[PDB]
């Protein structure tokens, strides 16, 4: 039966169901006062499913000039066409090999770029914004969103939307490497996975995926959805409280330290964005600190909401294309205060 939600991470994560439900906010609020992420399924629903397909955007935008991102290495690919990112995102055959002869995995860094994603891109922009989940909050002007009301004593976010697209990671060696490395946001945000791209050529990758979200520490429940209805799953989160942040930061100073790093004792290792936390950095987490967070899986049409504050990583399963919208709740204002 259709219902109006669930839980998972063991009862610690709100799954809502209908992304538009007018009531939403009434379960919401509760969970996002007591610092937690929040997941809302179904959005790919609610959106124009032709605007959002990896080959229009090579069509549309392919000539642009772009960096990209070696994910394996951090290596920085300078001033090549953006088609030579798009045409690979599926067909494996097409990518941009390393020296070794492999294809690469890949990330296209900052496009559309700085705040142009509106001018570029004005239909994605309104079927995007008229359709994000807990609208009060996530609009540019709702009534539960602070950041055009707010003076210059708060940090504000830049005019959004911002597009994340990177392919899946894809080995065993893989499994320790980020898509986005450990970091935090002084704002609130909504996540939405638009597009996921499960690839051909080296098509039959299923099972290294299942060691992922198993050693991911995924729940019981999330394994259900991949088996029993062969929902899209597009990539591995784990998002830690704002409170746990300085606890975050005395392990990764200690880890770096036994590496032979030389830093100095105050150094911000979460503000760096240089760490991924695999599985032994979070055990070594939750055994030495007594840290938990919580470990969560992205399929197609999820919203995943980020507390400001909140210490988070990303890691691809497979190529995805996400959208994300800062804001400024009241429940978490004192996140961009400027004065300590
Ligand atoms: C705009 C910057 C000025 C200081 C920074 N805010 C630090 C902070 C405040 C409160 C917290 C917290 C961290 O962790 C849990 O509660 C943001
Ligand atoms: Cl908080
Ligand atoms: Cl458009
Ligand atoms: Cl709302
Ligand atoms: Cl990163
Ligand atoms: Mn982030």
Known sequence: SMTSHSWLCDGRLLCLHDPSNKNNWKIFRECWKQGQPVLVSGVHKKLKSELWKPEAFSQEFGDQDVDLVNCRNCAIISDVKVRDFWDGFEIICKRLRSEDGQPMVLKLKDWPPGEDFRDMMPTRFEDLMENLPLPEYTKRDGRLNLASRLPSYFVRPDLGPKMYNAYGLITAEDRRVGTTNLHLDVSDAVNVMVYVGIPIGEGAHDEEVLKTIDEGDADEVTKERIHDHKEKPGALWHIYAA?????????????????????????????????????????????????????????????????????????????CIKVAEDFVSPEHVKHCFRLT
């Open 243 to 319: 409170k746990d942040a300085e606890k975050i930061r005395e392990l990764l100073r200690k880890v770096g330290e036994e590496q032979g790093q030389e830093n100095p004792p105050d150094h911000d290792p979460i503000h760096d964005q240089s760490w991924y936390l695999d599985q032994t950095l979070r055990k070594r987490l939750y055994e030495e600190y007594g840290v938990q967070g919580w470990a969560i899986v992205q399929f197609l049409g999820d919203a995943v909401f980020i507390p400001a504050g909140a210490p988070h990583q990303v890691h691809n399963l497979y190529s």
